[PDB]
Short mmCIF file of C-alpha atoms and ligand atoms in Angstrom, two decimals:
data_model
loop_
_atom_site.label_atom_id
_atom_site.label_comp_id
_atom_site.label_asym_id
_atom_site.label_seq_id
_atom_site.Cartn_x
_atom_site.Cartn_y
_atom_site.Cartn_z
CA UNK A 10 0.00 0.00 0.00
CA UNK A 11 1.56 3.23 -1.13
CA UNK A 12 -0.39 6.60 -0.74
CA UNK A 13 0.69 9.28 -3.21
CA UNK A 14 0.67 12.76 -1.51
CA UNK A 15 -1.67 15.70 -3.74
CA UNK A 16 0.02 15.99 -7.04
CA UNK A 17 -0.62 19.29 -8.59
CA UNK A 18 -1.32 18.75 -12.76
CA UNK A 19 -4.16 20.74 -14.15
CA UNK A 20 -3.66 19.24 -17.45
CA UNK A 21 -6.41 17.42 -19.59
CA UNK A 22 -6.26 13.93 -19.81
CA UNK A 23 -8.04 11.56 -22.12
CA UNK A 24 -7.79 8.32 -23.77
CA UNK A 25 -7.84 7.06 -27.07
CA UNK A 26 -10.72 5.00 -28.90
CA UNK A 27 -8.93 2.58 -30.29
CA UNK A 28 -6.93 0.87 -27.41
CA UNK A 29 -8.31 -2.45 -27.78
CA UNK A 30 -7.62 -2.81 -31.54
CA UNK A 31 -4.23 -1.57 -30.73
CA UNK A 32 -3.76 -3.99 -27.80
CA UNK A 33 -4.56 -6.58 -30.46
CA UNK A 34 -1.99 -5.74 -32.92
CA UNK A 35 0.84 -5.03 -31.10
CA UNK A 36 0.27 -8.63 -29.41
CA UNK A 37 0.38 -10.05 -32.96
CA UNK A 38 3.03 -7.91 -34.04
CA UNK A 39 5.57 -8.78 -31.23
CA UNK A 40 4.17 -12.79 -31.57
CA UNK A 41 5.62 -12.45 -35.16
CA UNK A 42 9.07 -12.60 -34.34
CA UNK A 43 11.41 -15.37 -32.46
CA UNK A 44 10.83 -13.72 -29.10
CA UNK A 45 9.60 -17.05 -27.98
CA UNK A 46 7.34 -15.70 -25.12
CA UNK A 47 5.70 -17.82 -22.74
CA UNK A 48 1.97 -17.15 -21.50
CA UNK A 49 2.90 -15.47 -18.25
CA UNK A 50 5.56 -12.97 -20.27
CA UNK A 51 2.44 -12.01 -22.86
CA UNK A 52 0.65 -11.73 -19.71
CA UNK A 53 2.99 -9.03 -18.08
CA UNK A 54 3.14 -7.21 -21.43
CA UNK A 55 -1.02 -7.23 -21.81
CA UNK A 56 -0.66 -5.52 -17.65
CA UNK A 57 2.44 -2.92 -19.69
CA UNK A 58 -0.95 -1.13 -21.16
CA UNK A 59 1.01 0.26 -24.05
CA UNK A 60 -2.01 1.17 -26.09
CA UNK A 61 -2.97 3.09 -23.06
CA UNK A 62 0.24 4.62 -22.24
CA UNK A 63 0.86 6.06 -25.79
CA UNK A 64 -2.45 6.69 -26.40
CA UNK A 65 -3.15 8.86 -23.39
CA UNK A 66 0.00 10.95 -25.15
CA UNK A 67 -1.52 11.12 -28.63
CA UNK A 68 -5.86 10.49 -28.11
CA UNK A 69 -6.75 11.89 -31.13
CA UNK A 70 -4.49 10.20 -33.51
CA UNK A 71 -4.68 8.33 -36.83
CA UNK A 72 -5.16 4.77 -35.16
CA UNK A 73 -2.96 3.24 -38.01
CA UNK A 74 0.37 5.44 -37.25
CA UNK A 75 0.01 5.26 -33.32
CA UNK A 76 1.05 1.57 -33.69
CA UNK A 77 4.13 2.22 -34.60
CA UNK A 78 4.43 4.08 -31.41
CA UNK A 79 2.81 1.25 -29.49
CA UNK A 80 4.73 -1.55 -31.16
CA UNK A 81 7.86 0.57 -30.20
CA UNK A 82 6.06 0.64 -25.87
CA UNK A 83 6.03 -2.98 -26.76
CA UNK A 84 9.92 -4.15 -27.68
CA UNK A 85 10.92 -1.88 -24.90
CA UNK A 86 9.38 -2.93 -21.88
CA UNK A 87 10.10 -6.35 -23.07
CA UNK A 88 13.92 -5.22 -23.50
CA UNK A 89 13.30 -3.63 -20.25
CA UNK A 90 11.97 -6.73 -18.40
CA UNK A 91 14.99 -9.37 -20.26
CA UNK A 92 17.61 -7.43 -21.03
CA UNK A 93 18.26 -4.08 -18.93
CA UNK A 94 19.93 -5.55 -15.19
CA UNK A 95 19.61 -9.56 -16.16
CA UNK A 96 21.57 -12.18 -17.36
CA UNK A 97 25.09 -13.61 -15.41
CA UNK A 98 26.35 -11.18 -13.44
CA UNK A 99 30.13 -11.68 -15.24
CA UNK A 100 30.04 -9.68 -18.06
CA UNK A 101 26.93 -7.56 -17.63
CA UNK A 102 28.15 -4.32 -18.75
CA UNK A 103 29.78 -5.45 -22.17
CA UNK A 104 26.77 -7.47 -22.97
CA UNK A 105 24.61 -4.26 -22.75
CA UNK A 106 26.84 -2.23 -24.45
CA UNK A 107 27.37 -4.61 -27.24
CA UNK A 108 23.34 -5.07 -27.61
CA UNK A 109 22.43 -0.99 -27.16
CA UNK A 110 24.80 -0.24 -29.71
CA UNK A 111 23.03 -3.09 -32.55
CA UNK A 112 19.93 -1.17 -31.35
CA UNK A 113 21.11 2.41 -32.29
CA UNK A 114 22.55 0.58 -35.91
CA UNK A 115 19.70 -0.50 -37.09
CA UNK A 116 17.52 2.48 -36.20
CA UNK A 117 20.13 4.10 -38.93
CA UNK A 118 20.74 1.26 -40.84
CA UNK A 119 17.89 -1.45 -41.15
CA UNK A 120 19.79 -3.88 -42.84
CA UNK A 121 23.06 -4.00 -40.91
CA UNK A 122 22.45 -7.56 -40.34
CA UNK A 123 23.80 -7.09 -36.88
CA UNK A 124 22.96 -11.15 -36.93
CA UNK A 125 21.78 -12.85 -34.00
CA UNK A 126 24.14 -14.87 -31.12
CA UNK A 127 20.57 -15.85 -30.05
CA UNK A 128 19.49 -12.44 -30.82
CA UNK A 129 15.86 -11.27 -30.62
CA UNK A 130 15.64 -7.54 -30.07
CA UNK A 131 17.09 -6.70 -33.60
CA UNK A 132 14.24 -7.96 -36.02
CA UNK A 133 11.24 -5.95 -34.32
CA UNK A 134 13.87 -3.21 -33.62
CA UNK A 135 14.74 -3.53 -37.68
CA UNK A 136 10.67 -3.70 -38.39
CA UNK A 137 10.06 -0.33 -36.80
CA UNK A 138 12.97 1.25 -38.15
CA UNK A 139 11.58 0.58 -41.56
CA UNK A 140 8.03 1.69 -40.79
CA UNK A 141 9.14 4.61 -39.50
CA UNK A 142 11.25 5.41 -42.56
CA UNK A 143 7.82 5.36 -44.51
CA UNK A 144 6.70 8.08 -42.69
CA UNK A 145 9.54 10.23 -40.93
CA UNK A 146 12.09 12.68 -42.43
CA UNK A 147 15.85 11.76 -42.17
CA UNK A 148 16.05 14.77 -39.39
CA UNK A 149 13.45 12.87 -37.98
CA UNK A 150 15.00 9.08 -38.12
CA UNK A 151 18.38 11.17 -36.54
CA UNK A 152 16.68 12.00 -33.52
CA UNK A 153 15.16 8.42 -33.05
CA UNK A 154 18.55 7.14 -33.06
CA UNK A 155 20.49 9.85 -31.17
CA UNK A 156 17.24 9.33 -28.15
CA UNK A 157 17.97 6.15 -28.04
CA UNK A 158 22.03 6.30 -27.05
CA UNK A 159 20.98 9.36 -24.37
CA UNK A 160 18.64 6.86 -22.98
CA UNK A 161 21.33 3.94 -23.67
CA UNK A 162 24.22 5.88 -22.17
CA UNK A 163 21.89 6.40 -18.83
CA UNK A 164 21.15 3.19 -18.86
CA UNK A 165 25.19 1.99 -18.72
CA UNK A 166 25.32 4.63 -15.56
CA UNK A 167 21.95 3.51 -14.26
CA UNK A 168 24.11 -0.19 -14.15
CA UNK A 169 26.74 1.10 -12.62
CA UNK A 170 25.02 2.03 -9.53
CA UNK A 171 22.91 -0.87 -9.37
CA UNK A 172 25.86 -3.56 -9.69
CA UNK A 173 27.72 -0.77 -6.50
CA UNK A 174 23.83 -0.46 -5.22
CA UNK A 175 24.46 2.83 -4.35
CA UNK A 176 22.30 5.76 -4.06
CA UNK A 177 23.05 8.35 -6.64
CA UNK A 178 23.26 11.95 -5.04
CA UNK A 179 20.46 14.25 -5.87
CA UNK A 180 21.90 16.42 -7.97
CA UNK A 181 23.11 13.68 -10.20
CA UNK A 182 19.62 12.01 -10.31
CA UNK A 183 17.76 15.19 -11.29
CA UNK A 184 19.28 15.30 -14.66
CA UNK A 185 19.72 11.82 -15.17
CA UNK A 186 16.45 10.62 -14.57
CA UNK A 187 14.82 11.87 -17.86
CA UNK A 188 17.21 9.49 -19.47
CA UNK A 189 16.77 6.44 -17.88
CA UNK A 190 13.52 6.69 -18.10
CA UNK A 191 13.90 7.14 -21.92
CA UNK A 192 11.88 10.62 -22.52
CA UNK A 193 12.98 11.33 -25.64
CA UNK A 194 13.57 7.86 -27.14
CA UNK A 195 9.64 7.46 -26.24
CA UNK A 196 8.37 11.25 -27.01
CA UNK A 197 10.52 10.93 -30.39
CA UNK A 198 7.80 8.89 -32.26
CA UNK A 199 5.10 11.51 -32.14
CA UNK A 200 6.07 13.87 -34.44
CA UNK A 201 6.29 10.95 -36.90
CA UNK A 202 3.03 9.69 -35.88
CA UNK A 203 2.00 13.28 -36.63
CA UNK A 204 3.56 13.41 -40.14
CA UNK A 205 5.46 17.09 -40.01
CA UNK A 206 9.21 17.51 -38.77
CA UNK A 207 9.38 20.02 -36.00
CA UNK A 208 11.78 22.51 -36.83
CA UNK A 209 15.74 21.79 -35.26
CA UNK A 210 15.94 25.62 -34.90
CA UNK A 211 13.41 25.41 -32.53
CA UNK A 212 13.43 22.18 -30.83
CA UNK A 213 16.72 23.48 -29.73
CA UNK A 214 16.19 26.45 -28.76
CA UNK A 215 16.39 26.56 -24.61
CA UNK A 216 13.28 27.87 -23.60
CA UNK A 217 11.99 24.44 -25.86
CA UNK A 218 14.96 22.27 -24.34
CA UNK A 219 13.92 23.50 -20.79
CA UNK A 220 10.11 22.23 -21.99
CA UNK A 221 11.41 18.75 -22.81
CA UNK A 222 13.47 17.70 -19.78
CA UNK A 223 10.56 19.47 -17.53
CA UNK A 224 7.88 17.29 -18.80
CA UNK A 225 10.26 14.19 -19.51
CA UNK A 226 11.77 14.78 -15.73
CA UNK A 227 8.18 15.14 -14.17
CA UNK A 228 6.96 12.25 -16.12
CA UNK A 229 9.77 10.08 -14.72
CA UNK A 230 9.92 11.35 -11.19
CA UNK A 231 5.80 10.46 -11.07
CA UNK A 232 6.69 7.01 -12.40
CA UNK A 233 9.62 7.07 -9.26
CA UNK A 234 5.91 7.41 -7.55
CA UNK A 235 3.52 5.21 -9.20
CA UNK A 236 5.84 2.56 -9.25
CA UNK A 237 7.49 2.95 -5.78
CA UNK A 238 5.06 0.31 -4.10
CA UNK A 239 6.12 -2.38 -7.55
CA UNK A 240 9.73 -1.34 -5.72
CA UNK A 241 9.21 -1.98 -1.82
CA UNK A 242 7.03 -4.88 -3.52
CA UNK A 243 10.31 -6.22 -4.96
CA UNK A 244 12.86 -5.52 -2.07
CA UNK A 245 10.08 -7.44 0.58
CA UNK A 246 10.31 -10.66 -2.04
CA UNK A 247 13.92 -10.96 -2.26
CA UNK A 248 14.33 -9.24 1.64
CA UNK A 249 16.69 -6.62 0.71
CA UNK A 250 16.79 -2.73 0.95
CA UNK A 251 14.90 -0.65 -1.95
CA UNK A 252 16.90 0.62 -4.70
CA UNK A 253 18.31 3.66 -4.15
CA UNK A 254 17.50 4.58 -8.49
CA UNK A 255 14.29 6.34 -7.23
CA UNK A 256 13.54 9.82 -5.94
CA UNK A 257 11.73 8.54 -2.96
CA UNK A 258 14.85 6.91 -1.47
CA UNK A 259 17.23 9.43 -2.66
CA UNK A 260 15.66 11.86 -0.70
CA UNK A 261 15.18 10.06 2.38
CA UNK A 262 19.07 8.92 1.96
CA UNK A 263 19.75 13.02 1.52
CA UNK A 264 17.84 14.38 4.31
CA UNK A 265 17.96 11.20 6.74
CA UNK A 266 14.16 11.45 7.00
CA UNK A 267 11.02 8.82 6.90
CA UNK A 268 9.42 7.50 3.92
CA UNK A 269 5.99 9.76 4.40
CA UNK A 270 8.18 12.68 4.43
CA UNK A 271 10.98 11.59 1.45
CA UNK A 272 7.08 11.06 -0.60
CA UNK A 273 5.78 13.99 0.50
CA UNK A 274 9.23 15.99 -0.76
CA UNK A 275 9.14 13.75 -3.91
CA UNK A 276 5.58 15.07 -4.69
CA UNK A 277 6.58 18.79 -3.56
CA UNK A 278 9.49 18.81 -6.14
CA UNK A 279 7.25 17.49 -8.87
CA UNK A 280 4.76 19.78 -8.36
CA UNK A 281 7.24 22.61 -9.07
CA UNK A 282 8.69 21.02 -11.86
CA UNK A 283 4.83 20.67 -13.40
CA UNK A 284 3.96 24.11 -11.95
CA UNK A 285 6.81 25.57 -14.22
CA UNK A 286 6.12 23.85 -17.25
CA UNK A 287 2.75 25.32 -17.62
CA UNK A 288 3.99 28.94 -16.99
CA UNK A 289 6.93 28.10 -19.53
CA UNK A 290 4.75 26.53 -21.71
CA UNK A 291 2.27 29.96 -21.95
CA UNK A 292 5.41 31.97 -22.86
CA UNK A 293 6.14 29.26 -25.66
CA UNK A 294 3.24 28.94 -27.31
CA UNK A 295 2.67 32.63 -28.62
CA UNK A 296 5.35 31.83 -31.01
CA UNK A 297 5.51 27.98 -31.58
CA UNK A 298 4.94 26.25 -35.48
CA UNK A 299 2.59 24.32 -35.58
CA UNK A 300 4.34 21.13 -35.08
CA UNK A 301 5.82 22.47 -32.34
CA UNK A 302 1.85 23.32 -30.80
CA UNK A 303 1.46 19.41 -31.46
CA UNK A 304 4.32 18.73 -29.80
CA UNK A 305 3.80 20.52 -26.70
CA UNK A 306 0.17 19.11 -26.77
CA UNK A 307 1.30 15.76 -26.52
CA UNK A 308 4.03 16.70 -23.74
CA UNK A 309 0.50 18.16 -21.78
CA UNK A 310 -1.01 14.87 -22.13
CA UNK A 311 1.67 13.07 -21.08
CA UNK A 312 1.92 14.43 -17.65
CA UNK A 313 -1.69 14.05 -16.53
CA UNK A 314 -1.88 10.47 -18.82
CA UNK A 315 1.08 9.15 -17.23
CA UNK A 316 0.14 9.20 -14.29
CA UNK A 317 -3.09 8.10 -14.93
CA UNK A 318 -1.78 5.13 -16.90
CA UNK A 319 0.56 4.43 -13.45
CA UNK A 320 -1.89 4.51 -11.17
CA UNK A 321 -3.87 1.83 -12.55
CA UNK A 322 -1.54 -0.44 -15.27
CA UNK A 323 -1.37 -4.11 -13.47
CA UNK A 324 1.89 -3.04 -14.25
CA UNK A 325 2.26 -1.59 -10.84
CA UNK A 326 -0.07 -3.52 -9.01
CA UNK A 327 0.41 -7.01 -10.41
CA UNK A 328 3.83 -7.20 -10.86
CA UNK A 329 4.57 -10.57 -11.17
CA UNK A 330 1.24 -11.23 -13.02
CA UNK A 331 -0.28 -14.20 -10.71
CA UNK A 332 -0.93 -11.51 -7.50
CA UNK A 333 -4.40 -9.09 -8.46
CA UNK A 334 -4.27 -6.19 -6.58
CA UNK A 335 -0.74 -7.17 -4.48
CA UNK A 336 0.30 -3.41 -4.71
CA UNK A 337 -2.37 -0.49 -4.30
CA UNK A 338 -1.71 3.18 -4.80
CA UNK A 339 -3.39 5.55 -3.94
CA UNK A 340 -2.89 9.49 -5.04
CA UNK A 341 -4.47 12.95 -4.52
CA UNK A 342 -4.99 15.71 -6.85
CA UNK A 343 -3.99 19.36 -5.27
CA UNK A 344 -6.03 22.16 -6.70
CA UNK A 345 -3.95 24.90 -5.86
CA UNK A 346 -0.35 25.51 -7.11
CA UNK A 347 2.63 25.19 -5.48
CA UNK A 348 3.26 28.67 -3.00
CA UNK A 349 7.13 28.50 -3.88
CA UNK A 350 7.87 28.98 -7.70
CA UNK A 351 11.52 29.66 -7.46
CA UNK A 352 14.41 27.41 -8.63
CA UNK A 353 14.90 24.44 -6.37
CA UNK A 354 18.68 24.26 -4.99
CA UNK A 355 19.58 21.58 -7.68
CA UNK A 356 22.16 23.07 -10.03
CA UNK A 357 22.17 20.31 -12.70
CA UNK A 358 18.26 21.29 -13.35
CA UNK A 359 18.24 25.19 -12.55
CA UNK A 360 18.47 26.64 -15.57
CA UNK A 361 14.93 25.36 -16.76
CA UNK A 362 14.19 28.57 -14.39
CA UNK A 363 16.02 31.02 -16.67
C1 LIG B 1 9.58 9.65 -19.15
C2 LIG B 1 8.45 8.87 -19.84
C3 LIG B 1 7.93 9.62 -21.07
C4 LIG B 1 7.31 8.45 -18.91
C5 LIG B 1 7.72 7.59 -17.70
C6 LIG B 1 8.62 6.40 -18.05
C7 LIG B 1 7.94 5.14 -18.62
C8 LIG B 1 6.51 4.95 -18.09
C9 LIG B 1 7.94 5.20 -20.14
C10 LIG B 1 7.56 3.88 -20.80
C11 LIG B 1 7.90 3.88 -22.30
C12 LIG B 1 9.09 3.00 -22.69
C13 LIG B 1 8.86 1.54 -22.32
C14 LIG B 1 10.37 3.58 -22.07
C15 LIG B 1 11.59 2.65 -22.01
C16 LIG B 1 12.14 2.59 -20.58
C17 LIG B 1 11.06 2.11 -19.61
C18 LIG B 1 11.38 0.69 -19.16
C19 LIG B 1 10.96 3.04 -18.41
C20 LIG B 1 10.03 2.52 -17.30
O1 LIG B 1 10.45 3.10 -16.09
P1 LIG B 1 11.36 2.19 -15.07
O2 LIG B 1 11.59 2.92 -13.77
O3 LIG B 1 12.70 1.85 -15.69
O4 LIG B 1 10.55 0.79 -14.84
P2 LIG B 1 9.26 0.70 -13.86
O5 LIG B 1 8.48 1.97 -14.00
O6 LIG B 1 8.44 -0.52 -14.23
O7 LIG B 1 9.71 0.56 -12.42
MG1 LIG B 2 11.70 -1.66 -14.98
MG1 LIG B 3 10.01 3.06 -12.10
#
């Protein structure tokens, strides 16, 4: 039982009408390949709720371009759940490295033929890739590729504290975070899906930059949240302590406090970082293309669909896929923004406050 302090996100959330034919699909899709999955793994991916993850993000688009969003939700929690901290200890890292890096190939080059030493990731992985090149511009393909080695690269330093199991410092988190939890490797399908390349000059721009790793920060830290109970869930099975890769612990490790308080400054800090957003977003839009509008629309559904999705994906409450209703979370909505609107006193993540 985890109970979510009052989240403050007065953002719009809605779903979209086609889940179930897209939950259909992407099964079939992913059943295509040599993934060889057993009943209880198609199980755990039918609790993943991709349809409803990506279509919370994008609820009123074309039904037939969203899968290759969803199919994309699908490889990766599978790669996730089999690949990302598994496998013989001896040699962890280099087998990561070596497999990430086929990954980010074929995204560029769909007919590497980076083989297969029992490989399985690299033909659905090669599948999208080409689907997407239907659709995308090569700007557009460039930034599928170059998401996935930021979220790649976090994942080597994610490993690194995992194999130590330390407790990254809070500074370091706050900027990491949005790449472990793959932001832009996830967000980078939409404007695809949406058929019109946003323009580099302004993607880059900060006051857009400072947009993206708000929302793709917030996003992750609520997932820290919604899937904090999945964690204490997983540390009471094999009786050890709780990872210290979640916001929760990091700040209870940083300010030697109890878990209702470390959630209750978890929940503070996101409320900021959501708080901000908006206002940034309202200075932003004046100005924005309009694939950069779409864009910004989908990073507003995201926050209030995430969490949404979180709080009720047997995902996070049915983790190992035999236990309904094991884990329960609970969360509250706060109505009224957060009184402090400065900069919090984490310099890796300031300047979004410019
Ligand atoms: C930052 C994003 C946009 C939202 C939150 C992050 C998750 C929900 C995105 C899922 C989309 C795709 C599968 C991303 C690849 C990485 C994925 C495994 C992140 C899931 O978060 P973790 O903390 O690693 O795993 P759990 O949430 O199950 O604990
Ligand atoms: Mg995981
Ligand atoms: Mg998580």
């Amino acid at each position: 039982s985890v109970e979510i302090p009052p989240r403050y996100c007065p953002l719009p959330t809605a779903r979209h009408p086609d889940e179930t034919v897209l939950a259909r699909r992407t099964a079939d899709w992913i059943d295509g390949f040599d993934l060889e999955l057993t009943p209880q793994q198609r199980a755990r991916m039918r609790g993943n709720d991709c349809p409803g993850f990506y279509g919370r993000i994008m609820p009123h688009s074309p039904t037939d371009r969203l899968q290759l969003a969803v199919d994309w939700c699908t490889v990766m929690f599978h790669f996730d759940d089999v690949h990302c901290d598994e496998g013989p200890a001896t040699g962890r890292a280099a087998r990561f490295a070596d497999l990430a890096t086929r990954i980010v190939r074929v995204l560029e080059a769909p007919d590497a033929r980076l083989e297969g030493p029992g490989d399985t990731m690299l033909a659905p992985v090669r599948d999208l890739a080409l689907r997407a090149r239907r659709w995308a511009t090569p700007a557009q393909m460039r930034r599928c590729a170059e998401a996935h080695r930021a979220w790649f690269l976090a994942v080597a330093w994610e490993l690194g504290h995992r194999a130590a199991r330390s407790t990254p410092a809070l500074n370091d988190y706050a900027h990491m975070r949005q790449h472990t939890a793959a932001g832009a490797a996830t967000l980078a399908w939409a404007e695809i899906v949406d058929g019109a390349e946003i323009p580099d000059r302004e993607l880059s721009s900060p006051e857009v930059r400072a947009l993206t790793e708000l929302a793709f920060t917030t996003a992750a830290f609520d997932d820290d949240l919604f899937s904090y109970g999945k964690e204490l869930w997983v540390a009471r099975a094999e009786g050890t302590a709780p990872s210290g890769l979640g916001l929760v612990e990091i700040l209870r490790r940083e300010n030697r406090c109890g878990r209702p308080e470390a959630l209750r400054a978890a929940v503070c800090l996101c409320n900021r970082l959501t708080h901000r957003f908006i206002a940034l977003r309202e200075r932003v839009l004046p100005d924005a293309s309009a694939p950069l509008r779409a864009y910004l629309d989908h990073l507003c559904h995201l926050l209030p669909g995430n969490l949404e999705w979180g709080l009720t994906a047997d995902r996070y409450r049915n983790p190992d896929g035999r236990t309904p209703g094991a884990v329960t979370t609970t969360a509250s909505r706060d109505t009224d923004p957060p009184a402090d609107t400065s900069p919090p006193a984490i310099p890796s993540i300031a300047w979004w406050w410019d």
